[PDB]
Homo-oligomer: 125 residues x 3
């Protein structure tokens, strides 16, 4: 049940220009599919499968720097290191960083953020 | 205004098989209604009412373990302990855990996660 | 790349009564537009531009205190202090608090919460 651990949160654009998607639902499928693919690959190499909860969102920033009025379509990916499956937090933390950089590449992103946050996880099973 | 406290985050499936829901909006109403019900019950017993902000999402994991392509419908519930209403963080923390386990039961979930995160809350009123 | 910093999270209502909005998409545009406006103003005074990732949500609380069945439309705004643009975490933290109070005023909110959370940011560029 109880355990002090890490959660991650990744924010990424959806590059509608490159992928030609027109709805948020399409962008969520795009990013979900890409994550499913690269997490699987990395799982078959390290036996660490990093799941992700993904939410659609909009990022609001300066219109002078090219943000559309009221914000730009983005996706947020979150996940947590469950010590029932994760034996080393550092190996997991390095795997997340690896997947973050690969997601940035697959999504053709100029920038991407990956945060880690200390969290106390309760897992009911 | 300022105060160092706890926030919780709960991730749960929506069990479309059990409840026969076909849209995300239906799943959000389902989980919102259940939470409204059990938080009320627990409030009438402990005088602690735990509110929750709920967001629809998708959880992406291995397709070999039964995840649909691009992810499975989930809901995220978040909330924070406001010291203007919460006199003991530990009683609140135990009440959240109680509601988490009850939500897992009402949602017929095999598993469920409940995290607590240290946060500095500013409450403007 | 690596850096220990702060993230913020703001939860706000959308006051459909005041603004006469009928869809979530309308409420997201409303809040996105307001944030874009006040962050720009504050940027031109302090040279700190605070971006925000915004998500629609519902807040579930007691129906006796006026919450609709299954929850009330809300918006969640999140952001992070990137030390590549933020030279003083305290000036940034004060600017977020400033924008939070201004957003509360522009949204005609009785209450509003603003949380800060310690986070380790990895910025890929």
């Amino acid at each position: 049940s109880m355990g002090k651990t890490l959660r991650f949160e990744i924010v990424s654009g959806v590059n509608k220009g490159y992928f030609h998607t027109n709805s948020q639902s399409e962008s969520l499928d795009l990013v979900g599919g890409i994550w499913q693919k690269i997490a699987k690959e990395e799982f078959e190499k390290s036996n660490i499968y990093v799941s992700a909860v993904i939410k659609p969102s909009k990022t609001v920033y300066n219109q002078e720097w090219g943000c559309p009025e009221n914000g730009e379509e983005t996706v947020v990916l979150t996940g947590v290191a469950n010590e029932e499956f994760v034996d080393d937090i550092e190996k997991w933390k390095d795997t997340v960083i690896k997947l973050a950089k690969e997601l940035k590449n697959q999504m053709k992103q100029s920038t991407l953020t990956c945060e880690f946050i200390e969290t106390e996880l309760h897992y009911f099973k």
